[PDB]
Design a protein around this ligand. Sequence first.
Ligand SMILES: O=C1c2c(O)cc(O)cc2O[C@H](c2ccc(O)c(O)c2)[C@H]1O
Length: 152
Amino acid sequence: MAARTDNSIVVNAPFELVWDVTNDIEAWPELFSEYAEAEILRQDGDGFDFRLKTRPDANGRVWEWVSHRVPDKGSRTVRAHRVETGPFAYMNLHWTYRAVAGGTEMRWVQEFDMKPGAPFDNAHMTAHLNTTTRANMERIKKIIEDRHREGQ
Ligand SMILES: O=C1c2c(O)cc(O)cc2O[C@H](c2ccc(O)c(O)c2)[C@H]1O
């Protein structure tokens, strides 16, 4: 009926740094391989809306959309959803951060459903997002650990 991704990775760095790096929207084009532009459009206290524009994808297509994001550092969680859904009927995001031995575990969850007629169906988009998410989490893990190394 619906689609979902659930990926985790442990970053060998303190919560504060992991949280500050991953929630720095302006740095997303450097953190995420697929994002060319990331701009915070507006903010209503608790949350904010921001625009994302991708680099050309595996098929030479550039995508662009607006999303609503609500970070809650106190609860070490982030909630977000696409306002402009594109090929998705809907797309929700949920990130959690949990302290573990030696670092911080990040768990990213995506919940969505493809619009009938989309170029990709639930099963295939799920596989695609799992691949890109895992690669991004690994890359971000490295970037954060680089920064952590430089601080000490
Ligand atoms: O190359 C792509 C791709 C793919 O090759 C296989 C697949 O199964 C799904 C896909 O979907 C990607 C995508 C499109 C619009 C978006 O808003 C988004 O977040 C991701 C796309 O770039």
